[model samples]
Target: NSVSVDLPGSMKVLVSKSSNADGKYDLIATVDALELSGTSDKNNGSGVLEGVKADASKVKLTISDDLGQTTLEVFKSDGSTLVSKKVTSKDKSSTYEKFNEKGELSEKYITRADKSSTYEKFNEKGELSEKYITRADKSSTYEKFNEKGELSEKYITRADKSSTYEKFNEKGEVSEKYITRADGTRL
Candidate 1:
């Protein structure tokens, strides 16, 4: 059976990606047809085929039966990859990657089946400078790094809203710390 979706009423979140030389990712391609087929993987049982095309602009779609995963890659007019994303239907998880003009990975984001999410940003040198994580229990952690890619500070919030703040010394020692309770008391 084919899947029918309402574009207007459907709540689909599209995270904006790094821009191309054109200043932004141009919406140059559109899907002409969508077809559904049975998958060899009996566990997942289905697959999708997206026929997308635009005049001389190359956009590719690939689906993997394993884990019921689908990958969509959008290319710039010059043939460089603008952005790509993958989704796993089995777990309802998604991973997105944004590329710079040079086709280098600039950012990555992931949402897992367990309701956890992760975002990582890379510097021009390809080093991870910032990371943020959200757990299923509603707790979160944020971390930042220096130019040398060394951890500068890490802040974590527990499920009960208690928090711990930590800062690192030059030599990697935990020099500063703040352990606070949910009621605004400090330990």
Candidate 2:
């Protein structure tokens, strides 16, 4: 079924499943002025739930006006975390995968707040290998990888300065690195 409501300056529409005799409302979808939608399971409320699609895996939720929006993302296995970089026009976006016990992302990618696009590399075991960050300014962050698919270097650049580099060792340890300083010296 569908329901509509008009706020003082905005309007919203709620699309949900049909009601049952048990007086339980099973929510299915929602449409707002901004054209956002939310979905959930029918009975247990698990599996492929959508709550504002904040990131590839995270969901922005608000239970009430007083509660406000809360960022929520679920990761299984290694408990790794991926956060999106917030911007003015939109929320931050990044992509992550939920790993299995064997350390492989189980076929799906969680993309968070990606405006331009992002790339990820994985090891043979399916763990995260490297991450690349791209911005609209044409500059980007290139994360290097080693033979074992571990990150070995990170490069970042801005509009004014040259690119900065950070190197890591095989043990995932930061080795030696430097960045161009404003005074033209490597720091």
Candidate 3:
């Protein structure tokens, strides 16, 4: 366990580990404040690792430097902020977060500032459901249920566009919908 922060110009440091002293709390390293340069250069500026938790009930965070990494998940009982992910390898960058259990925020996937996308759905009580809005070519759509839960249908696509349909009532909303253009025409 460790924590360091120096304001003014900016500086942050965090380190954690837990093999089972009580369980939950993994964040090996984090050095901020532009890596000590104190901003101005060194890959611009941005670094964070606040309010962390990983087994108490889900709540983890990880923001990195050198140009990448971003992960955030929440819901330690009532925080209710689940989803935040970013991953990069070559240049070094990683972020993480994931939580679900009446905590809401089903998913918030990410790969980097460049581009990425991920989404999931479910709610009739089957659990796991989410909605995500993205920019720069990260289309999304999801929803599936039928083991007696209903929902039965839902599919969306984006990247250029071409796929749409929704029909859920019994209380799922989306009374009716249709869109299949891309030259196919369905309006």
Which numbered prediction scores highest in TM-score against the true structure? 1
Clashes of each: 0, 10, 5
Cα lDDT tens digits for candidate 3, 152-182: 5677777767778887867767877888866
lDDT of 2 by residue, 49-156 (tens): 234333333333222222222233443323344332111111334343444445455333333444555677666566666777666666778886777767788998
lDDT digits (tens) for residues 77-163 of candidate 1: 665556544444445777888877666778898888897999999988878989999999999999999887799999999998899
Lowest-lDDT window of 10 residues in candidate 3?
33-42
Ranked by lDDT, the better of candidates 1 and 2 is 1
Model 1: lowest-lDDT 10 consecutive positions? 6-15
Ranking by lDDT: 1, 2, 3
lDDT of each structure?
0.61, 0.47, 0.45
How much is the lDDT of residue 45 in candidate 2? Answer: 25
For each candidate, C-alpha RMSD in Å? 10.6, 9.9, 10.8
Error of 1 at 146 (Å): 1.2
The TM-scores of all predictions, comma-separated, are 0.68, 0.40, 0.36
